[PDB]
């Protein structure tokens, strides 16, 4: 089985996300509320997943550079990014802070299965 | 201060852009740049030696299936290698390709020195 971390600023939202990855496959789902700053500084943990799901709400330069600090520090961590922006420009900065995949808000089952078995292959 | 400890590999199937690529990068840092004529298609085959590069540039020119398909072959294969695609395409959707297949960052084309500068200065870093 595949572990993958959850992560948002918002239960609600968390929880649907939790329940679509669970649907997509056999993967080991955790949850947890907090932005990518605040994984950041209770670091301790992070190695025991292989795919890392940020929901790209508030994502600002702050929570560029907590991304960029925890693809660095976990190469075996697979950072997506959730979020209703398609610009060129989120994605160039997602791209420099190690996120390996953009996955559009409200989320298509059809593409997160796709997109985690891309992740599931490495 | 130390750049040449920095191994890039530039790579193009149109020799007029590899020779104008190689020479830009020369004059963004004192770089260790070695040119291959080839898509990344081609260098998939010719894995034998990648090891010894920091950072690979690809000119997306060539930017199809099967070179995407190539470049997620690369990157998997070799992590401590930064790809880098340089493509006239500015659409969300290539940049999702590309970052799906790898790729760490992407310059335009035509490329801009400074923008070339501070890529390189990225890639430098790690």
């Known amino acids: 089985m595949i572990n993958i971390l959850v992560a948002s600023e918002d239960a609600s939202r968390l929880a649907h996300l939790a329940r679509l990855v669970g649907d997509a496959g056999r993967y080991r789902v955790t949850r947890t509320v907090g932005r990518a700053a605040q994984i950041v500084q209770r670091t301790d943990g992070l190695d025991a997943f292989d795919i890392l799901m940020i929901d790209g709400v508030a994502l600002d330069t702050a929570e560029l550079a907590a991304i960029e600090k925890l693809s660095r520090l976990h190469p075996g961590l697979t950072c997506m990014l959730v979020s209703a922006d398609a610009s060129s420009q989120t994605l160039l900065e997602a791209m ?24 599931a292959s490495q």
């Open 96 to 119: 420099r802070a190690g996120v390996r995949d953009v996955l559009r808000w409200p989320l298509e089952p059809r593409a997160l299965d796709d997109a985690l078995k891309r992740a």
